[PDB]
Amino acid sequence: HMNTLKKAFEILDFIVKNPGDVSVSEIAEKFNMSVSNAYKYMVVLEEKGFVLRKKDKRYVPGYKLIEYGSFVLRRFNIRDIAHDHLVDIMKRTGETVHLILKDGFEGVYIDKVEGEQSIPMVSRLGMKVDLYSTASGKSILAFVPEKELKEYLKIVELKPKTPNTITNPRVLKRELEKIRKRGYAVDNEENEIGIMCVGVPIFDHNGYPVAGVSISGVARKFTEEKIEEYSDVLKEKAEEISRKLGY
Amino acid sequence: MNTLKKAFEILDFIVKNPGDVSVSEIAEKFNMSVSNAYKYMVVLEEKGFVLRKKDKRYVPGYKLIEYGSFVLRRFNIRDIAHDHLVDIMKRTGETVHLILKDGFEGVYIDKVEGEQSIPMVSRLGMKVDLYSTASGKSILAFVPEKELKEYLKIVELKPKTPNTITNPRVLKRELEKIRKRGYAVDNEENEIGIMCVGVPIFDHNGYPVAGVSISGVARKFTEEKIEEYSDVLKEKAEEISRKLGY
Amino acid sequence: MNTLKKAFEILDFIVKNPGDVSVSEIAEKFNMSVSNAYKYMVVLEEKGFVLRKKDKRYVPGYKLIEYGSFVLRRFNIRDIAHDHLVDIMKRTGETVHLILKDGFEGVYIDKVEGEQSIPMVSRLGMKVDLYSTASGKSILAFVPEKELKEYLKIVELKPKTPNTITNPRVLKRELEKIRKRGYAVDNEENEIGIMCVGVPIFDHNGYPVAGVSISGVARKFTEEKIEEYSDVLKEKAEEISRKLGY
Amino acid sequence: HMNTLKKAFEILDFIVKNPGDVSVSEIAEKFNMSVSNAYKYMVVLEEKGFVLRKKDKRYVPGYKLIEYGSFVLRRFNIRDIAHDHLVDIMKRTGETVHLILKDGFEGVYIDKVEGEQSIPMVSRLGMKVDLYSTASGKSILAFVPEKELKEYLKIVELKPKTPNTITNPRVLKRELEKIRKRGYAVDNEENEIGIMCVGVPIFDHNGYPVAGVSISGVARKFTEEKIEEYSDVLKEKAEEISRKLGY
Numbered sequence A, D: 001h002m003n004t005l006k007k008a009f010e011i012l013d014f015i016v017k018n019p020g021d022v023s024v025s026e027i028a029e030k031f032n033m034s035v036s037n038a039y040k041y042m043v044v045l046e047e048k049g050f051v052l053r054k055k056d057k058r059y060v061p062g063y064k065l066i067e068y069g070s071f072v073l074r075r076f077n078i079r080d081i082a083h084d085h086l087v088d089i090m091k092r093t094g095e096t097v098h099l100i101l102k103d104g105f106e107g108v109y110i111d112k113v114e115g116e117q118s119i120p121m122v123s124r125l126g127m128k129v130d131l132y133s134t135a136s137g138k139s140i141l142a143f144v145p146e147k148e149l150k151e152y153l154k155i156v157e158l159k160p161k162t163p164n165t166i167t168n169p170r171v172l173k174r175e176l177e178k179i180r181k182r183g184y185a186v187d188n189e190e191n192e193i194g195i196m197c198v199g200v201p202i203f204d205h206n207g208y209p210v211a212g213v214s215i216s217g218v219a220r221k222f223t224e225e226k227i228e229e230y231s232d233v234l235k236e237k238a239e240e241i242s243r244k245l246g247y
Numbered sequence B, C: 001m002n003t004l005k006k007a008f009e010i011l012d013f014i015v016k017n018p019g020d021v022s023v024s025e026i027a028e029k030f031n032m033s034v035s036n037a038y039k040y041m042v043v044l045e046e047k048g049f050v051l052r053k054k055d056k057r058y059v060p061g062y063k064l065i066e067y068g069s070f071v072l073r074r075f076n077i078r079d080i081a082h083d084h085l086v087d088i089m090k091r092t093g094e095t096v097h098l099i100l101k102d103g104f105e106g107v108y109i110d111k112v113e114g115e116q117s118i119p120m121v122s123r124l125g126m127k128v129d130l131y132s133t134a135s136g137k138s139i140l141a142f143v144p145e146k147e148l149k150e151y152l153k154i155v156e157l158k159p160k161t162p163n164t165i166t167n168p169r170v171l172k173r174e175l176e177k178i179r180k181r182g183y184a185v186d187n188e189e190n191e192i193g194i195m196c197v198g199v200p201i202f203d204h205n206g207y208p209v210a211g212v213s214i215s216g217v218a219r220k221f222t223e224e225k226i227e228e229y230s231d232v233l234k235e236k237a238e239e240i241s242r243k244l245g246y
């Protein structure tokens, strides 16, 4: 029965993703329960700061979650070591910049600087990224010790998200080497259609690929020269950041 | 049924713990069987609020960032502060503004003016010079050392009025004064004939995300009105900032 | 106790009457004794909602202007429309914006984006090019003849995108199309990779005070999605405009 | 008893001048009456559009009053005949512009174009103006047939609003003539301290002073040359507008 816990986290997950607000009455009707017991969950969520109650007694998300996110981001020294180089990359390219943290066979958005114009990409901090269909991703898969690598191609599926999503490990391997060659990667609409990217890795103590920095924007912009320009500023900050990581 | 308590309580410990913790350690610390703690832990890991490392110890999960940013992105200080603003207008009768910080500029996110107050040209979604205003200067006074140093290194301090501070060094002094004063005053620095008293609104990290202020005809702003005015501002400003997690 | 009815009813007649009226005429028309009508009239004149001319005939009072402007000045279309906006987002899952007209520019007064929608750089209190957007073009389509002629005579139609209309004559055509179409569509005219469908919000005088729109990745905007999308917009737009007295 | 009418107009006057909103409960407590009878007034006010009821059942002013004001303003042809010249005067001076309608021994603000900066003046449409302590006012009192004039000085008090508010009819008369001379007036902080103005009249069919147009701003700006400049653009539009009034 103790999995009441589940119910709690379902109600909360709902208020966070809910556009606007919600009344005690509405949550009850939502999760088959009396207004009385809804108050059981809502009063604790409110007291803990996960939710804010309006003068009209309707509910809105609180600040707690915001504080929690910062605490977790606060655990990645790289974030503070890079943030400004990212803001600079955005001011010198005008393009959105991403920084993905390497976590196993997945990546996580740990920082993002929006560009001058909105781009048809759905990314946000905390979100996860496929290390194969993305530039900063392959850029990372192009330096993981061969051993670890070999296993990735062995485990991770390659469900093609777009007609350009590489689904063959022999091509992906060669692809990765090309990246080792140039020293960066390119996402020719392999992750999201309409969007292309350029990425470079970030090494740590023992030169392991612990991060990925990339420039993202609409396909139109990424020309041969543009690419050369982006990967240029990218590698420049990469090297500087990597240094801080004791490399 | 208030296990909801231990749940968020265990979640709070993990998020605020720099290192990690094992299920048994959570059990010992929060006084419960290893089987019950595995329950809180099985669900928190389930919803992604927690991550279990190879060595089995737990650390906070990525979902907290996902939720954090998603919430911050749609948080509305205006919907939260408005009534306080209206209130500020009931105890002073002078128009009131709320300014949001947008880098090195401020945005007017709300304004409560009374029938008796001065009609102002300022309107929602209008830029605010951070250096020539009380709310803006209040925001500057608390900005992080490095950022303020930067502000002064890039922003042009135009002479819009005879009183406008135009010397970065003279301004930094003003801020250090405001910083210690607790509030700022616009002595016809933004506009001629108009004065303002402004305080900052802090977020949970203590960052000056915005400022509230009172604007009126210069004359009305006497040493005693200002002290009177400011006090009202902070009072309502603490409430707002507290609701932001401060 | 519903004499409150005849009162505003008599007030309504006077305000909407181009000429004047005497107490006896109000009595005859609204079926009452000359003494009772003098009562409604004594109070309306009292509160200044009515003025008695030298020839004794009555005409509307200056207070109606005083109240009118005081109310207009603080009317908040955003507080009025917001929930509708949230609603627009529940039936389309695509971010939604509300744009206020500020002369020849538009101001973003609100935006409801969903977890599934495209993260947009646009934010409250940000300028909107009226010629390169769906909400903005919707506002143009209904602007008063003389004003639009003027708009085209002073505004620079920059080529921000390959699709942006830059020919005043070509634009006026688009508007006449939108005017008759009932809504507007931003075919990657504002930004590349993004499309929008937008309708106007009218005030009581039929003036396009603002516009609501749906924004999403260009691809998603198919002939059927657009028709689907627009319909939702007007539905919610009529409600808003109706609450503005339209 | 029928003066329930009074109560109605007191409640309404209150919601209009009330910052924020009000609940049925609050109005009742405000005007000593049961929530039940408050609904009597609030339901009609709502049905007539004078008030708007929120989802939270709290009340906010409606659009009706806005519509009513326009209808009354709609009765002064001069308004539409001048409005643009006013917008032009503001764009060519950067100063706030006013247009007061002559109504007996008082004036009424019938149009106003705000300037680039907020000025310490409290003016709004519909408001009334003393025809003696204001520029557009004296500018009008400088052309009213002497007969009518003589009576004004005879009736209207001159309660000095500021150390510069003329309280002597002999000085006011001479003052007025100076105005007839120059062809315009000047408010050296005679109406409001901190504020100075420059005004010119607007004549009708039989050349009667039916209106007043003026430029308003902080005292600092009104220099000998500035004044000359303002009264220049002022008289220019005046003449043009007056023409339309069949003059």
Ligand SMILES: [Zn+2]
Residues within 6 Å of the ligand: A134, A135, A136, A187, A191, A196, A197, A198, A199, A214, A215, A216
């Ligand atoms: Zn990428």
Ligand SMILES: [Zn+2]
Residues within 6 Å of the ligand: B132, B133, B134, B135, B186, B190, B195, B196, B213, B215
């Ligand atoms: Zn200020």
Ligand SMILES: [Zn+2]
Residues within 6 Å of the ligand: C132, C133, C134, C135, C186, C190, C195, C196, C213, C215
């Ligand atoms: Zn658009």
Ligand SMILES: [Zn+2]
Residues within 6 Å of the ligand: D134, D135, D136, D187, D191, D196, D197, D198, D199, D214, D215, D216
């Ligand atoms: Zn004046």
